[PDB]
């Protein structure tokens with residue numbers, strides 16, 4: 342369904358291990374180049390919102406992510422995010438008709454109450470939760486959606502896509 346341009350659709354998009362781990366040591370603890378393709382089709386041409394630590398985790402070669410208005414949340418007024426914009430709270434981050442929150446753990450939790458879509462790649466990797474891990478947000482019972490089929494990446498890693506939505 343098309344988004345009426347006067348509304349404010351907020352989506353979250355992330356990839357997680359079975360356990361819910363999404364981040365560890367300032368990085369994503371797997372590599373799934375196939376997952377980048379879905380990430381691009383979902384986010385291209387819209388505003389993307391990320392926490393400062395996720396900005397730090399982006400490779401300099403793709404930073405800011407092209408074709409998208411990059412917004413970084415930080416409480417550091419002097420933060421340097423070249424080619425992006427830095428806002429100090431959530432309200433000014435979510436002003437676009439369509440916004441995709443692209444991480445990390447803190448900012449997913451912050452934005453979830455306002456979101457009506459989650460695009461979730463589940464990676465079949467057994468990484469138990471560890472102290473300091475960044476984690477996927479917990480979805481309450483208002484969400485619903487579709488579970489995709491498992492597929493192998495070129496590397497042999499198995500993954501599948503969940504598309505969740507709510508009113």
Ligand SMILES: NC(=O)c1ccc[n+]([C@@H]2O[C@H](COP(=O)([O-])OP(=O)(O)OC[C@H]3O[C@@H](n4cnc5c(N)ncnc54)[C@H](OP(=O)(O)O)[C@@H]3O)[C@@H](O)[C@H]2O)c1
Pocket residue numbers: 354355356357362363364365366367368369391392393394395396398414415416417420428429430431443444445446447448449451475
């Ligand atoms: N698997 C995935 O799909 C995926 C996607 C993205 C990221 N990641 C990984 O997730 C990890 C990063 O997640 P994280 O939870 O540690 O950090 P994060 O959510 O990316 O960023 C946290 C930072 O955002 C700022 N912030 C948080 N709440 C704010 C608020 N209400 N107002 C203003 N600023 C706020 C603060 O920046 P300041 O400290 O500068 O004040 C805070 O330190 C990394 O490991 C990353 O590689 C994984």
Ligand SMILES: CCc1nc(N)nc(N)c1OCCCOc1ccccc1CCC(=O)NS(=O)(=O)C(C)C
Pocket residue numbers: 354355356369376377378380381395398399400403406407442443444462
């Ligand atoms: C792709 C990981 C990911 N997957 C999902 N499903 N949701 C996320 N929020 C997520 O993290 C998005 C932020 C982390 O992004 C990373 C991390 C490592 C290497 C490169 C990057 C840039 C991403 C990139 O290359 N994007 S792209 O549009 O293909 C164009 C910039 C090449």
